[PDB]
Design a protein around this ligand. Structure first.
Ligand SMILES: NC(=O)c1ccc[n+]([C@@H]2O[C@H](COP(=O)([O-])OP(=O)(O)OC[C@H]3O[C@@H](n4cnc5c(N)ncnc54)[C@H](OP(=O)(O)O)[C@@H]3O)[C@@H](O)[C@H]2O)c1
Ligand SMILES: O=C(O)COc1cc(Cl)ccc1C(=O)NCc1c(Br)cc(Br)cc1Br
Length: 316
């Protein structure tokens, strides 16, 4: 259905994927089912979403009934930063893999570069809500994750919310076995990530755009916050193609060869979001969209700036 972006490992990563963050239990199973029916093959998951067990349900159902084969699915999950200590990496992964009911993952990502206090309290924080650091680093984590690849439990590794400084630190680590195949970051016309995408691509690293629609149901949304889907200039380009603004926002990444993972649990929208291979944004339209950059982050759950490898301070 979707076209593909070739990874450094020669694996083919479907350029549109289904997001699952905040997809509720009792909706996410049906969401995944609808998505596979609509041609989605790439599903973006995480330990921290606490819904992997229902995603696994849906995947197994579709495989059994022959709607799809495992080899054609592309499943991604993520290691949460309270599990950067070596033995916890394995255990967190195992729970993810067991929840998803799979024999391997296509990509396993470091979810966030900063280590938090180790353990099963996922959001350790002080009274004021600032995150509590842990000693284990993302390099400690990467070491344990490389084993998973050695064992064939994960086909490739990647990173998420890394600046070019953290990737350089990864790439320059002596004794590295495996390199990251993607860096999953917020990306949309208000945060176009030009310098980061350029850097990543120069190093044979793809980019995966999260929150492409500006994540409109984030509860921390203040009414003065910019709304991509309601943006007049975005809607103007959509109208020109008789498409929706969401479709334009998704197609934007495709034309930059950037993988994109819109989240939805609404069947019509899930279908809508992958109907993006029958129109093309013009060079001028792409240029206009690129000019919307505000360096605005929707997903800045911060209060971790005080810890060492904070990614959002750097220029890119
Ligand atoms: N690695 C990371 O740190 C990180 C951070 C954030 C997100 N992510 C990943 O990226 C995915 C996508 O980002 P996101 O979930 O933050 O937000 P998003 O995909 O930008 O937007 C999701 C919201 O948009 C709505 N929506 C979806 N399609 C729509 C359409 N065609 N028209 C109007 N509204 C539509 C959804 O509503 P309904 O669901 O009610 O249909 C939902 O409220 C996540 O699910 C997650 O897998 C990763
Ligand atoms: O990754 C996501 O989909 C959204 O983020 C989260 C979702 C859950 Cl259910 C729990 C935690 C997070 C989260 O904070 N993830 C990463 C993160 C981001 Br995005 C931004 C900042 Br600032 C810090 C962190 Br940690």
């Amino acid at each position: 259905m979707a076209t593909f972006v070739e990874l450094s490992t020669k694996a083919k990563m479907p350029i549109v994927g289904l997001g699952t963050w905040k997809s509720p239990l009792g909706k996410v199973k049906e969401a995944v089912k609808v998505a596979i029916d609509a041609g989605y093959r790439h599903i973006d998951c995480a330990y921290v979403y606490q819904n992997e067990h229902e995603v696994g349900e849906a995947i197994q159902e579709k495989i059994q009934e022959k709607a799809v084969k495992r080899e054609d699915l592309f499943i991604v999950s993520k290691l949460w930063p309270t599990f950067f200590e070596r033995p916890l990496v394995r255990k967190a992964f195992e729970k993810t893999l067991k929840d998803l009911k799979l024999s391997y993952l296509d990509v396993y990502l470091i979810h966030w570069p900063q280590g938090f206090k180790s353990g099963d309290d996922l959001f350790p924080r002080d009274d004021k809500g600032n995150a509590i650091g842990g000693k284990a680093t993302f390099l400690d984590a990467w070491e344990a994750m490389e084993e998973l690849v050695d064992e064939g439990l994960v086909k490739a590794l990647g990173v998420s919310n890394f600046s070019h400084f953290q990737i350089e630190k990864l790439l320059n680590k002596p004794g590295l076995k495996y390199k990251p195949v993607t860096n999953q970051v917020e990306c949309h016309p208000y945060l176009t990530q030009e310098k980061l995408i350029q850097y990543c691509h120069s190093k044979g690293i793809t980019v995966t755009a999260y929150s492409p629609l500006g994540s409109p149901d984030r509860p921390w949304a203040k009414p003065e916050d910019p709304s991509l889907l309601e943006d007049p200039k975005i809607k103007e380009i959509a109208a020109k193609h008789k498409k929706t603004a969401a479709q334009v926002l998704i197609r934007f990444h495709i034309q930059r060869n950037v993988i994109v993972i819109p989240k939805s649990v609404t069947p019509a929208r899930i279908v809508e979001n992958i109907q993006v291979f029958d129109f093309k944004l013009s060079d001028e339209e792409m240029a206009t969209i690129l000019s919307f950059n505000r360096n605005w982050r929707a997903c800045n759950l911060l209060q971790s700036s005080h810890l060492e490898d904070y990614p959002f301070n750097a220029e890119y």
